[PDB]
Symmetry: none
Subunit: 158 residues, 4 copies
């Protein structure tokens, strides 16, 4: 057996494990004393496993945390903006069929909104509603300056 | 057996191991007492292994960390810009098929965006969506001043 | 055996070792207690070994560190510029086939960019893309004031 | 009988001196002392020949003033900024395959650039590239005011 990763959360390990199993890769999981997970595979499947994980963006990379960068007027305003982004994500994530959401705000304001849907749901009829919710959440934002992109978790082709 | 490299992250060791194995170099991996990965090969494969790794830029070089250069107005704005770059990378990294992303922002603003896609996903038709997402994330940025380049891993 | 260099990193030692071996030089390596490497060669190969290493830029020189020179608006602007150079090197280094990159910025701005490619990848068709990425990363930079030079490690 | 030539040498310089002597048909032995520095010795009968060869090649190498010692102010600041730029450009140029060593002296407007090249590489076709990289690294520099001189180590 070849080790893939240790120290995985339950969710990360489950997603990677399910992905590999669905591609007929023999993967085994073990839990350490902290409750974190280790995935391993047969040596003969190692290259195939890494290709599959790589192509699917696993393990997921981390990005800068505002609370680490800023643990001042401009600093305060970045924290206020971040709170608003999080509030809008929280709200949009209650729409049935939404499974992930990112909002980046520029406060004439503008906003970028990425919504990931269940593969079995088409959120296109909700785009006008989403834009109106974002518009009215945020100071001085017009419809023409909100970009909404919707994607199925199953990929670019739906 | 001959140790090639120690102190590797799990991800980098896996990339290096898979690369070697796919070029028919037998390689073994182990974890040391600090939790870092070591890769080893047979002495007879040493030169080939290093040639392969060198040609693929492994082990990967590191670059300056903003938090080290700056552990002040200009310093503050650099950190605000970095946060925005990271926010945009985080958002773009949720697009199906994106496996790596870099954003460098100049705030008339401009922006440079490199997207690495899965070799199995064609992201070229998404360039305008990606451009529009970046445009609306950042103060005073026009489409004509955003470069989006997509490369397959 | 004659000593070449001690205190080498794993990468520097591996690269020098592989280079020498590929040129039919009998080189041996030993690890010290700190994990650093020593390379040695037979005395009869010493001159040739030093020639080959010198010709390939080994061992790599240390150049002035901005954090040492500047441990002021001029000093602040140098560090901002350095951060941007590093950001651009980090970005360009994700392009498949890039194995090394240097960026020197003059902020009309100008920029100098050197990219070292793998011997097995032709990055010449990517020069315009690289130029455009650099252009839009940096305040007040036009295409005609960006030099991009690509060299194969071969 | 053996006779010491020099102690306190860096590994790089002892290697240069050892290779020079061997290639000029003088045997040499090397050791590392307790402080990590290198000592070169010869058979006593070879002492005059050895010192002659070393003297004729300028070894051991003279040292030059260190900006961080002369300046341990705006004129001082600008010298340090210039030095950083010179070092950045040397670092960049030193990545070009075939470059053994290089020096850059900037007047910020004009620049002087010396490159020492491998005898196995022809860098003459790269002079225009080198000039353009230097030009675009540095404020208000024109091609006509950049001198690039390339010399083989041979």
């Amino acid at each position: 057996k070849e080790q893939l990763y240790t120290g995985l959360t339950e969710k990360e390990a489950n997603q990677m494990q399910a992905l590999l199993l669905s591609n007929d890769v023999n993967v085994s999981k073990e839990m350490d004393k902290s409750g974190n997970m280790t995935l391993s595979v047969a040596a003969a499947d190692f290259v195939r496993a890494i290709t599959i994980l790589n192509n699917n963006g696993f393990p997921k990379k981390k990005f800068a945390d505002i609370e680490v960068i800023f643990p001042s007027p401009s600093q305060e305003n970045a924290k206020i903006n971040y709170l608003k982004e999080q509030d809008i994500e929280r709200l949009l994530s209650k729409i049935p069929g939404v499974i992930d959401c990112s909002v980046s705000l520029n406060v004439p304001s503008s906003a970028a909104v990425l919504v990931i849907s269940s593969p079995e749901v088409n959120l296109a009829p909700s785009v006008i509603q989403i834009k109106n919710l974002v518009k009215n959440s945020v100071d001085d934002l017009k419809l023409e300056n909100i970009s909404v992109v919707i994607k199925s978790s199953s990929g670019q082709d739906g």
